Amino acid sequence: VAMLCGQTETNLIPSHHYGKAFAPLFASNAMFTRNQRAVITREAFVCAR
Amino acid sequence: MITIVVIPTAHFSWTDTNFLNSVDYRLTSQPKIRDRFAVYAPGWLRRQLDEFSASLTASELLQALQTIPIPVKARCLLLPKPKRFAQWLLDVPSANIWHIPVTTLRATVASKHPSSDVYNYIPDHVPPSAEFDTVTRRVAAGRDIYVRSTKVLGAPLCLAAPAKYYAGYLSTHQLDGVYPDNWAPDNFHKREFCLTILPSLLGPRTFLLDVDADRDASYPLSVLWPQLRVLALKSRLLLPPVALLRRVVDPGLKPTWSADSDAAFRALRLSRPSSASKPTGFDFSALPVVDIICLFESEPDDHGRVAPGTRLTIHSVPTDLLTSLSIQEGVRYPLRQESGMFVPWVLLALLMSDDVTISGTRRSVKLETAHASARPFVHITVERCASARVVDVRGSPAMYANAVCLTLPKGSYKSTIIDTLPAMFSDLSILEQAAVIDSDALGDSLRPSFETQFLERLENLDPKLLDRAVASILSPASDTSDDAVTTVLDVFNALYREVMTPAQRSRLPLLTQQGRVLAFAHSDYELLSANIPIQVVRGSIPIDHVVNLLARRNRVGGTALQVLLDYCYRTQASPLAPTPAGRLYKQLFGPWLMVPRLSDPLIKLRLVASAPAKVLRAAGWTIDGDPPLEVSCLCAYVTDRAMAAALIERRLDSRALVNVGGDQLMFVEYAPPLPLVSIPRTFLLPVTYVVHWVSPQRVLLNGGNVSFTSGLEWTFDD
Numbered sequence A: 001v002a003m004l005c006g007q008t009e010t011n012l013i014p015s016h017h018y019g020k021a022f023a024p025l026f027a028s029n030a031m032f033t034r035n036q037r038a039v040i041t042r043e044a045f046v047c048a049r
Numbered sequence B: 001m002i003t004i005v006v007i008p009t010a011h012f013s014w015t016d017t018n019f020l021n022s023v024d025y026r027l028t029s030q031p032k033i034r035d036r037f038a039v040y041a042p043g044w045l046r047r048q049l050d051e052f053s054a055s056l057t058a059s060e061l062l063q064a065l066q067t068i069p070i071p072v073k074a075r076c077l078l079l080p081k082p083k084r085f086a087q088w089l090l091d092v093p094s095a096n097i098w099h100i101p102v103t104t105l106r107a108t109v110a111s112k113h114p115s116s117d118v119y120n121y122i123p124d125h126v127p128p129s130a131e132f133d134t135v136t137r138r139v140a141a142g143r144d145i146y147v148r149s150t151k152v153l154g155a156p157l158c159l160a161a162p163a164k165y166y167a168g169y170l171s172t173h174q175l176d177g178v179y180p181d182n183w184a185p186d187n188f189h190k191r192e193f194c195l196t197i198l199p200s201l202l203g204p205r206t207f208l209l210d211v212d213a214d215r216d217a218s219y220p221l222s223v224l225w226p227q228l229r230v231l232a233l234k235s236r237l238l239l240p241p242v243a244l245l246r247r248v249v250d251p252g253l254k255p256t257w258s259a260d261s262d263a264a265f266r267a268l269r270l271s272r273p274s275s276a277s278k279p280t281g282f283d284f285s286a287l288p289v290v291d292i293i294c295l296f297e298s299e300p301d302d303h304g305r306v307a308p309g310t311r312l313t314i315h316s317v318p319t320d321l322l323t324s325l326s327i328q329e330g331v332r333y334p335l336r337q338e339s340g341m342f343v344p345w346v347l348l349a350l351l352m353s354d355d356v357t358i359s360g361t362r363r364s365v366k367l368e369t370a371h372a373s374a375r376p377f378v379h380i381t382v383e384r385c386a387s388a389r390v391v392d393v394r395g396s397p398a399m400y401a402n403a404v405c406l407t408l409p410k411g412s413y414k415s416t417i418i419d420t421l422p423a424m425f426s427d428l429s430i431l432e433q434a435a436v437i438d439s440d441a442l443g444d445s446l447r448p449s450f451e452t453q454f455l456e457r458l459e460n461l462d463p464k465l466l467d468r469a470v471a472s473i474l475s476p477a478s479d480t481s482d483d484a485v486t487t488v489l490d491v492f493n494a495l496y497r498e499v500m501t502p503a504q505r506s507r508l509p510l511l512t513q514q515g516r517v518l519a520f521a522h523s524d525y526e527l528l529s530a531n532i533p534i535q536v537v538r539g540s541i542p543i544d545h546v547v548n549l550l551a552r553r554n555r556v557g558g559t560a561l562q563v564l565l566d567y568c569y570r571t572q573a574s575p576l577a578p579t580p581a582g583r584l585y586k587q588l589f590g591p592w593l594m595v596p597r598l599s600d601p602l603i604k605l606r607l608v609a610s611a612p613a614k615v616l617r618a619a620g621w622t623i624d625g626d627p628p629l630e631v632s633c634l635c636a637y638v639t640d641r642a643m644a645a646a647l648i649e650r651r652l653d654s655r656a657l658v659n660v661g662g663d664q665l666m667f668v669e670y671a672p673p674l675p676l677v678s679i680p681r682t683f684l685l686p687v688t689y690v691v692h693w694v695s696p697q698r699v700l701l702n703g704g705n706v707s708f709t710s711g712l713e714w715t716f717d718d
Helices: A014-022 A029-048 B019-023 B043-055 B058-065 B082-091 B102-110 B132-139 B172-177 B222-235 B241-245 B319-324 B344-352 B414-425 B441-445 B450-458 B463-474 B482-505 B508-512 B545-549 B560-572 B581-593 B613-618 B641-646
Strands: B002-005 B076-078 B145-147 B157-159 B193-196 B206-209 B286-298 B310-318 B356-358 B377-392 B403-407 B517-521 B535-538 B603-606 B609-611 B629-632 B635-638 B656-660 B699-701 B706-710
Touching (some): B019 B193, B058 B222, B206 B222, B310 B319, B310 B377, B310 B581, B319 B344, B319 B581, B344 B581, B403 B581, B450 B482, B450 B560, B463 B482, B463 B560, B603 B641, B609 B613
Parallel strands (some): B002 B193, B002 B206, B076 B145, B403 B535
Antiparallel strands (some): B286 B377, B656 B706
16 A cells, blocks of 8 residues: 555645754764764773773 | 753742742841842643643753743733624724725624624734744733634733623633733832743843742743753753852852852751731741752771761751751761760751762762771761751642551661650650551560561571571672572461461551551552551652661661561552652651751640440440540641631531440541642641540540541640
């Protein structure tokens, strides 16, 4: 049903829609926490070994 | 104007006169300090958050709110339904500021289906087919907004037109809810600092206040706490509460430029010189507490030198306890008594606290208070107050004025708090020892005590099996060791089920149907298995009980039966998260501790219930005088006679089922249970109370047992 009933608004520009939708996601440093935790993970791992 | 965003903590007091106090009451100590802060945090916004809480994710909610300026100058202007709304532009023609045609207006008046045309093309009209953010975006513009629904967020919501159009279109309570917004605005002022519950973009002039306690679980925005905290953490924007007291803000403790040695920092100096003749001669529901850091030290070495020692954090000890005991900072008090036990006041501090942790890290520890540890501590010094705030107490751990049972593991220090503390005052009525129920009472009731009977059954087993069981219980790594322990458990369970349950069930009125009962039990199962209608609170104390009872040698068992019983009860207890017993103690004794700080005398009260003389005489009682007898169910205390009398006209919707035997053993029962929150927070209740005749000389002879029902009525007394 999904692959046979897909439809969108008539005059759609993907770039505008995606950009307007993705804007709130990349708004803070939160997207970089994993980097810091990975760094600590490395140092902890080596020292333990 | 630096802004500090605030997220309330676990039991944040909200009905307080000033939101500021619940943050940290030290800020109110000095006029020179309290003048530097604004608060905002309006009620209308609070109500909106309460509603939308169930309909937005944390990320969405934060994303929506973060852009709003500090004083919200905009309003949401609700429009009435088109048939109603259209008449407004003709009732006042100049009010047709959009100049919608008269023909269209009266065409709407004629139509069976008045269309949205009257709304159509009106600038900044918000149809029901809109979303939360649509409002918030316009809120940043400061201008008022016109909406077609009540469920809106970000600005105070008020009627656009007089109430006549919205009437019928909306109902009474709905029509009522907008009244403060109809005349919403109030000014906001440019002081040095302004606290706010409204989030904001964290930056060079905005800070997140860190209190080091769990959030208010009920507060709708607590879900934002992690994201906010981590963002502040990664940019070093947290502020410990102490930083607020300094002349210039900086995140840190022990700064170079300030010694932080001033009366403002010392939270122990709680002072209340000002007055306003307000009805709250005292609000005994608001309790100031402190988190303190204390240094512990052992005996010095052979040359007078001493080890570095260790410092621990004690959480939320009530401050009046320390003040009334004249405790002062920077003083090295002796910790140990003559017999090596802790000095009483320290024990009270531990008992009424919420938790004890290592000062630096966040690891909670159960403190030992016996001869177990080598190089044991002998001196204690309080160093500083990490936090000092007022907290709401009303009905928090317990709910009913009737009674409450607290479960604690065997070996707790309940005796200290129930005896030494009231004895330390012994001048104001706190409780009646005849009303508190020791957890051991029923075990002592059997002609051979429950312990003796258990011992007598137990010895029939082989000694080696018992020896193996005891060792396994002590040795933590001895997982299960089924054989030895399970056998003992079977004997314990079989005996308890056999004898204790009927004996317990035979004391039902004694536990609940007295004036006000405080009871202890070794496990909630002790009550549930007997069907006793009393609230049970699963408490815990931050001290190691196992070692503690290992020091009590004068018992029926040679310290081995005790640990066996302890394990059995713990096994019997139901698995659930237990609460800190200090919170319950704070609810009961806390208000009393504030009595000596008061300036004016107390006023007694009670809610005596009548008793017709007919039934008494019919029961063979000899009584003088016709007027119906009355009996005091529970006494209370206030200090403002004016408001107290003003609050005495309420008729409690809780009947009393009084019962009394010929032996004058008197009992009370409230058919609708009496909840503590129903008590006005200006009152003050004793921890326990015993029902009694208001005038025992009226009766001349006790006939048979008597029961009757009557209403309840608060009244004065002299």
